[PDB]
Amino acid sequence: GWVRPDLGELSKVTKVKTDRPLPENPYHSRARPEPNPEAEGDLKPAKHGSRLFFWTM
Partner 1 sequence: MLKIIIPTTMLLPMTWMSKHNMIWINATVHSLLISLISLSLLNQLGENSLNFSLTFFSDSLSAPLLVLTTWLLPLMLMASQSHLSKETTTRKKLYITMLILLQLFLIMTFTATELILFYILFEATLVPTLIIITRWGNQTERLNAGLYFLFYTLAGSLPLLVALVYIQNTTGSLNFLIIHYWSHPLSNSWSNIFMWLACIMAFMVKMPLYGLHLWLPKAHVEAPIAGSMVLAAVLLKLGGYGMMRITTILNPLTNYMAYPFLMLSMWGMIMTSSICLRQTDLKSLIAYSSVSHMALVIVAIMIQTPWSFMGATALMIAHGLTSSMLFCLANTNYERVHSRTMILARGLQTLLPLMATWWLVASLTNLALPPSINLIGELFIITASFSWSNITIILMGMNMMITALYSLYMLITTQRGKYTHHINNIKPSFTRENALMALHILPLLLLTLNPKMILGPLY
What torsion, rounded to 10 degrees, do the Cα atoms 31, 37, 38, 42 define?
A: 160
Residue whose CB is less far from partner 1, 2 or 53: 53
CA dist., res. 2 & res. 11, Å (int): 19
Q: Is residue 45 at the binding interface for partner 1, with CB under 8 A as the rule?
A: no
Q: What angle do CA 50, 52, 53 make, to 5 degrees?
A: 150
Q: Is residue 50 at the binding interface for partner 1, with CB under 8 A as the rule?
A: no
Site string for partner 1, 1-40 (x = CB under 8 A): ----------------------------------------
Ranges assigned E (strand) in the chain:
none
Q: Is residue 53 at the binding interface for partner 1, with CB under 8 A as the rule?
A: yes
Q: Which residues bind partner 1 (CB under 8 A)?
A: 53-54, 56
